C-alpha cells in the first residue's frame, strides 16, 4: 500500500508551534511526500517561496534516513490560476517548453517525480489535459534512457461527479499517470448556507439529493470511468471546516451565516488544523453522523466538521476492501506533527492511524 503525504511551503510562516519545516517529517511515516507548490514562469517550472531551494534540500535529506522514500514536487494548487494552466496546455508550443523544463529541475533538486495539481480543468480543457499528461510521460520515458530511474507522474483529481465529467478523460490519463489522488474531502460547496460534512464516507440514508457527494460514490464512479484500482489513491483530510451558526440549531440542515472564525495558528476563516481541533474540543459537544461515519463538534456558535482517528481508520479500511493503491493525506503540517496538542504523546496522530490500518494487510 502507498501512503502519499503532502507538505505545504507556507506552513513555515505559522507562528510558534504551528511553524512546520520538512525537518519535522518522520522519514518512515509515508512512502511518498509531495512538496506543494511549484510555480510556472516563462513557461518553465520554477520555485515559489524565496527559500524553496533550501527547503527542497531539507526534505530530500530525509532520504538519507529512509532510502525507500520517494519525493515529488507538485505544480499548481489553489493560489495558481486555473486559466494559467489552461493557457500553457492549449498552445502546443508553450506546452513543449514547459514539459522540457521539468526533468532537469527535478534532477537538480533531487525529486523523484512530478505531481500535477490543476484545479480544475474545465470543459474546454479536457483534451489539452490529456495531451499534457501524455506528452509529459513520454518525456519522462525518454529521459530515463540516460540511465537513471524514471521520474514519476501523478495528478490530484476532483472527486465531484460534475467536475469529473466536465474536465477529465479518466480512461485516457489513467494509462499514463503513475497514480491518481482523489480529492475526496471537498464535498460541501462553500456555495450554500447550511451545515454539512465536507468528507463523508457514505451517502447518509437521510437525504435524497447530491447523492454524489461522498467518498464511496466518487470511488465507484472512477472505477467505472476506467481508472484502474491499483492506480487510485483516496484522499484523507487532516483538517476540518468550520461554520459560524445563524441560529441555535446544531443538527443537519441547520442554517449558516458564514465560515467559522479563524484558528490561532492557521489564521484562515473556514479552516482548522487537526491540532487546533484537538484544542477546540475541550468544552465542545461531539457528535457523529452514523450513516456518513464522520464526526462534528460544536461550541457556542461554532460548528466544525472534521476527521478523527476512528473515521480515518474507517476510510483506510474502506480503501483496502475496495483494493485501491493506497491513501493520500492532506496535509502533514495540519496533523499534530509536534504531537503536543492532541493528548496522547503520539506524533502525527491521524497519519499514523491511517498507516496502522494499511500495514494490517
Ligand atoms: C485546507 C487548506 O490547506 N487550504 C489551502 C490554503 O491554505 C492555501 O492557500 C494558502 O493560504 C496561505 C494563507 O492564507 C498562504 O500563506 C501565505 O504565504 C505567503 C507567501 O508565501 C506568506 O508571506 C504568508 O506569511 C502566508 N500567510 C499566512 C496565512 O501566514 C499561501 O500562500 C496560500 N497558498 C498559496 C500557494 O498561495 C491554498 C494554496 O493554493 O490551498 C488550499 O487548499
Ligand atoms: C509565478 O510566475 C508568474 C508568471 O511568470 C509571475 O507573474 C508575475 O510576474 C511579474 C512579477 O510580479 C508581474 O509584474 C509585471 O512585471 C513587469 C516587470 O518586468 C512590469 O513592467 C509590469 O508592470 C508588471 O508589474 C506580472 O504581473 C505577473 N504575471 C502574471 C501573474 O501573469 C508570478 O510573479 C509568479 N508567482 C510567484 C508568487 O512567484
Curated annotation (Swiss-Prot):
Residues bound to chitin: 49-50, 76-79, 120, 183-186, 241, 330
Gene3D superfamilies assigned: 3.10.50.10, Glycosidases
Domain GH18: 1-361
Region annotation (Important for AKT1 activation and IL8 production) ranges: 302-316
Gene Ontology MF terms: carbohydrate binding; chitin binding
Alphabetized UniProt keyword annotations: Antimicrobial, Apoptosis, Cytoplasm, Disulfide bond, Endoplasmic reticulum, Glycoprotein, Inflammatory response, Lectin, Secreted, Signal
Subcellular location: Secreted, Extracellular space; Cytoplasm; Cytoplasm, Perinuclear region; Endoplasmic reticulum
Highest rank taxon of the organism: Eukaryota
Methyltransferase found in the keyword field: no
GO cellular component terms listed in the entry, alphabetical order: cytoplasm; endoplasmic reticulum; extracellular space; perinuclear region of cytoplasm
GO biological process: activation of NF-kappaB-inducing kinase activity; apoptotic process; carbohydrate metabolic process; cellular response to tumor necrosis factor; chitin catabolic process; inflammatory response; lung development; positive regulation of angiogenesis
Disulfide bond annotation, renumbered to this chain: 5-30, 278-342
Sugar attachment sites: 39, 345
Function: Carbohydrate-binding lectin with a preference for chitin. Has no chitinase activity. May play a role in tissue remodeling and in the capacity of cells to respond to and cope with changes in their environment. Plays a role in T-helper cell type 2 (Th2) inflammatory response and IL-13-induced inflammation, regulating allergen sensitization, inflammatory cell apoptosis, dendritic cell accumulation and M2 macrophage differentiation. Facilitates invasion of pathogenic enteric bacteria into colonic mucosa and lymphoid organs.
Family classification: Belongs to the glycosyl hydrolase 18 family.
Subunit structure: Monomer.
Protein name (record): Chitinase-3-like protein 1
